[PDB]
Structures are given as structure tokens and as C-alpha cells.
């Protein structure tokens, strides 16, 4: 057991970004570019 | 400006700001227009407005 | 009151307070110069916001420029003429 | 402003007391956040808002006698009725000053719609993505899960020229 | 295109020293500006027109039944001329002169004109109202009688005279212009988006 004394660091900025399902944020240009533009999954896809 | 949050509150307050004129004389441009930072136990983060 | 100067005052990193020159002064009128040959109309020795004095010399002669004058803000008449002139002769 | 959220109805209706200072013009957004199970996304939405042109210090000006007509050289009293103290400025100007001029509309006749122009974001409300319509509204926010993009006599005229101080009742005479 | 500058300090309500006209006046529309010459924005901007209302003897309104001379309007356009005085009483009676003109733009302020009237009615308990029709305007001064061939405004004066008394006032109408093409229309306090 411990006592938190330090505040926990909160997630980084997805500024302007398509946020997949792990949280890899990459430009929006690569929406619908048929191919592995995540790299990590398919999950948004943008509908392409 | 400082605020401070509790439960009475629910979490959210609201601080005047006022800029006065502190800006640097002369200058190829006055404006500078401002950078806002937020300290905070959890979170940290700047934009410019 | 009204207010003239920065107002603003910052505090320092020594624990001090950098005032820039500012003062309180007024936003009621005193007595007017009081020459010998002028009679003031009327005759109080404090006048109020909004009210104006009538001005003039002895007989036979007029003042010259504007006969009436009227209490501004504070320690403000729109003409002063501090022992400027009254009137020499008006033929 | 802020309120909860439970299950009794689909919709809530919010009350919101209106004050003084929204006689002009203005507008209300209502954003609410959600968890996510990888990110979070908030949804905003804002319309409009229009109000009647209502003083604050309420500052009426009427003559002490009343009569449809007056016979010229009458002593007449007005009367300053406000609710707090303020500063008047009275100016009594001709009718027949109005020359053709495309119309002589008036000196001022906008106190309002001049001040419409403290309003930073244009059009009505609502819009895109939050970012697009917080843009619009007039905001710029920051939060964790998304960015906004910048992207002699008688007699001539005129007369009655004077500045006087002003408590919730004051007369004077001329 | 400046005459002077004052600067005051500031109550509320800036107090500033009469000003006096040159003794070579510019008529014009003039220009005032304001600024707090420190550090500040938002320049207020005023206008005032330097001309002579020595003696202004009584208000003549020109109110037309319509707007703009439409299609129907073509053929009959009734036009209401009233004149009052300053003091809330209307004219008991006067004679009022009306004089018709085409101006291609508002910018032209000289321009060719009837010619054919010079029509005399008179003002009837400070109300006047007659018939003007724009067929015979259009074919005998226009020098061409067709409503598509002429897209320009449209100069209405009206001279009003006392019978019981000398005395003359003026009024004027901008211009009303024939266009084919309808009014316009736009979107006010409406949002262009969907729910």
C-alpha cells in the first residue's frame, strides 16, 4: 500500500488527429487511404 | 489567477483575468497576443489565443 | 472623486507594491479670484454642482467677455480670467 | 451553469434566470463530456439568444407641466427620475434642424445595435464538430480529447448644453 | 481628405471646447474621429454636414404608396405628397408643384427630364395624393417606351408653395429604378444547419 501524493499524469493532446482504438493519433490526410494507416488496427477506417 | 475546487462546487470555477498594459514599448508589433498555461495537479497544458 | 494615474499597482517579487503616480482628485467650486472692482451674485463662500454666477462691475460700466459663469465639476469654471480684466469702458 | 442527469424523462428543461447585463444580445452553449473506452468526445450545441432593449438605470425625462401646448418664454421644470445615480447629459435640439439630407435620420437613434459589435463569432448558432461551432459562437476551448483550429434671440439652436449629477429624483429649472 | 486636434483628460461623458469653423468653410459631408492616443483600439467615427438651414418653413414627406415601380405599378403609379409643419399641425392648404425625371445612377445628379409636366395639385389637410403614370413619361421624354429597356433610377422633385402666403420647400426621392429581375432575398437569425 502507498499514499498518492504526486497527481497522476493525464493522456496527451489528440490535437486534429483520427484517434484509433489503442490511442496511436495520426494526421487526418491518411483517412481512407486504403491501406494500413494506422498500422496498429482497422477500427476507424473512415468508412473508405 | 488561482481558483479552487471542491464538491460544493462540483469541480468547476470560473477567475476573472485582465491584461493590462505590461506589454514591451516600441516593438515591430504590440501584440504578442497571449499564452495561456494551466497548472494543475493531473493535467498541463498551453495554447496560444 | 475622480481618478487620474495608472490606477493599477503590482506586487513585486521583494514583497513590495509598485505604485505608478496616481492620485484621488475631485470629479465644489471655491470663490472666484475676488477683485475689488468685481461684486459676485451670488455671494456664498461654497457653491454647488450646477449652479452659475453672475459676475459684473460697478455702474456705468460692463463686463467684458462672458457676464455669466458656471460651477463645473470642482475647482473647474469654463472661463477663469484670474485678474485678467473686468472692463476698462465700454463706449 | 450546471445540472444533472437522471433517468425520469428523455429530456430536461433547464431554467435560467436572465439579469440586466443580456438586454442587448446573447448566447448560451451546452456541452456535455462522456467516457470513452479508448478516447473521449464531447458534443456542444448553441442558438441565438434575443432580448427586449430595457435600462438598468431606467432614466426617464418629463416636464413638470403638462400641457399639449406651450406659450413661448414659459418657465417650464424638468424632472430626472433613475433608479441609481448617474451623470446626465441633456441636449435640447430643434426638430426643424432636420434638413432633407437623404432623410436627416437622427443624431444617435442606435445605443444597442451598435453595442451588438462586442459580439466576437457571427451568425445565429449551431453548426459543425465542436471546434467549428465554438469558433462560430465565439470561444476557442481546450480540453484532452479535441483541438480547435484557428482556421441673438429669437431664437437659434442649439441650446440647453449641460452635464449635471443625477440622484434617484432631480429637478431643475430654466 | 485633417483641421484639428484636441486632446482632454477624462466623469463619463468627455467635455470638449467649442469648436469654430474657418473663415473659408468646405461644404461636404465632414469627418470626426476619436481616439485615446495612449494605447487603445476601436476608433468612433462621426459625421456632420456643413450647409445652410437658415430658415426651414415647413417638413415635406414623400411617401409613395410603393416601394419600387413594379410591373403593375407600370402602367398606374400613385404617389402620396405631404407636407407639415414643424410644430405637429399639418398645411391647411398650398400648392404643390411636381416635377419628374430619369437618372441613370445616383451619382449623376444632372439629368434630361419632362417636359411634360409641371403638374399643379393642391394640399389638402396637409395630405396630397395623384396619379402618375409611367407609359407617357417613358414616350415622350425617355425617347424610347419599353420597361426592359431602361435599368436606372427614377428623380422625383416637388416644389410646394403657400397660396395664402410666399413661402417654398423642396423634397427630393433618391431614385426608383426598373429592374426585371426581382427582389432579393436572404436569411436572418436563421442557422443554415440541420437537427
Not at chain 4, 114 to 129: H, P, Q, R, T, V
Amino acid at each position: 500500500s502507498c499514499e498518492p501524493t504526486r497527481g497522476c499524469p493525464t493522456e496527451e493532446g489528440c490535437g486534429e488527429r483520427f484517434r484509433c482504438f489503442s490511442g496511436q493519433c495520426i494526421s487526418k490526410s491518411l483517412v481512407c487511404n486504403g491501406d494500413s494507416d494506422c498500422d496498429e488496427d482497422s477500427a476507424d477506417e473512415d468508412r473508405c | 489567477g488561482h481558483v479552487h475546487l471542491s464538491s460544493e462546487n462540483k469541480f468547476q470555477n470560473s477567475a476573472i483575468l485582465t491584461i493590462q498594459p505590461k506589454q514591451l514599448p516600441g516593438g515591430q508589433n504590440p501584440v504578442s497576443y497571449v499564452y495561456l498555461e494551466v497548472v494543475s495537479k493531473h493535467f498541463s497544458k498551453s495554447k496560444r489565443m | 472623486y475622480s481618478l487620474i494615474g495608472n490606477p493599477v499597482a503590482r506586487c513585486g517579487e521583494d514583497l513590495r507594491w509598485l505604485v505608478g503616480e496616481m492620485h484621488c482628485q475631485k470629479i465644489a467650486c471655491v470663490l472666484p479670484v475676488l477683485m475689488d472692482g468685481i461684486q459676485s451674485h451670488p455671494q456664498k463662500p461654497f457653491y454647488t454642482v450646477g449652479e452659475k454666477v453672475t459676475v459684473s462691475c460697478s455702474g456705468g460700466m460692463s463686463l467684458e467677455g462672458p457676464s455669466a459663469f458656471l460651477c463645473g465639476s470642482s475647482l473647474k469654471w469654463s472661463p477663469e480670467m484670474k485678474n485678467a480684466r473686468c472692463v476698462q469702458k465700454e463706449n | 451553469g450546471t445540472r444533472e442527469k437522471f433517468s425520469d424523462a428523455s429530456y430536461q428543461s433547464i431554467n435560467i434566470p436572465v439579469t440586466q447585463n443580456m438586454v442587448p444580445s446573447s448566447r448560451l452553449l451546452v456541452y456535455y463530456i462522456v467516457t470513452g473506452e479508448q478516447t473521449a468526445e464531447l458534443v456542444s450545441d448553441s442558438v441565438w439568444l434575443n432580448i427586449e432593449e430595457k435600462c438598468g438605470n431606467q432614466l426617464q425625462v418629463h416636464l413638470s407641466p403638462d400641457a399639449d401646448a406651450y406659450s413661448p418664454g414659459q418657465t417650464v421644470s424638468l424632472n430626472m427620475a433613475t433608479g441609481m445615480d448617474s451623470w446626465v447629459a441633456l441636449a435640447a435640439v430643434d426638430s426643424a434642424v432636420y434638413g432633407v439630407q437623404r432623410g436627416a435620420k437622427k443624431p444617435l437613434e442606435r445605443v444597442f445595435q451598435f453595442l451588438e459589435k462586442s459580439d466576437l463569432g457571427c451568425g445565429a448558432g449551431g453548426g459543425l464538430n465542436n471546434a467549428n461551432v465554438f469558433h462560430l459562437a465565439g470561444l476557442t476551448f481546450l480540453t484532452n480529447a479535441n483541438a480547435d483550429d484557428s482556421q441673438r434671440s429669437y431664437f437659434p439652436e442649439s441650446w440647453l448644453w449641460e452635464v449635471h449629477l443625477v440622484p434617484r429624483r432631480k429637478q431643475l429649472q430654466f | 481628405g485633417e483641421v484639428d486636434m484636441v486632446e482632454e483628460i477624462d466623469i463619463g461623458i468627455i467635455s470638449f471646447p467649442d469648436f469654430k469653423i474657418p473663415s473659408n468653410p468646405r461644404y461636404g459631408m465632414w469627418t470626426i474621429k476619436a481616439k485615446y492616443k495612449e494605447d487603445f483600439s476601436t476608433t468612433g467615427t462621426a459625421y456632420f454636414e456643413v450647409k445652410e438651414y437658415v430658415l426651414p418653413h415647413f417638413s415635406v414627406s414623400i411617401e409613395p404608396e410603393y416601394n419600387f415601380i413594379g410591373y403593375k405599378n407600370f402602367k398606374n403609379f400613385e404617389i402620396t405628397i405631404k407636407a407639415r409643419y414643424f410644430y405637429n399641425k399639418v398645411v391647411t392648404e398650398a400648392d404643390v408643384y411636381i416635377t419628374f425625371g430619369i437618372r441613370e445612377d445616383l451619382k449623376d445628379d444632372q439629368k434630361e427630364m419632362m417636359q411634360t409636366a409641371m403638374q399643379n395639385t393642391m394640399l389638402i389637410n396637409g395630405i396630397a395624393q395623384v396619379t402618375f403614370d409611367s407609359e407617357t413619361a417613358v414616350k415622350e421624354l425617355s425617347y424610347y417606351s419599353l420597361e426592359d429597356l431602361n435599368n436606372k433610377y427614377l428623380y422625383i422633385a416637388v416644389t410646394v408653395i403657400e397660396s395664402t402666403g410666399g413661402f417654398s420647400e423642396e423634397a427630393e426621392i433618391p431614385g426608383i429604378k426598373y429592374v426585371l429581375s426581382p427582389y432579393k432575398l436572404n436569411l436572418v437569425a436563421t442557422p443554415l444547419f440541420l437537427k
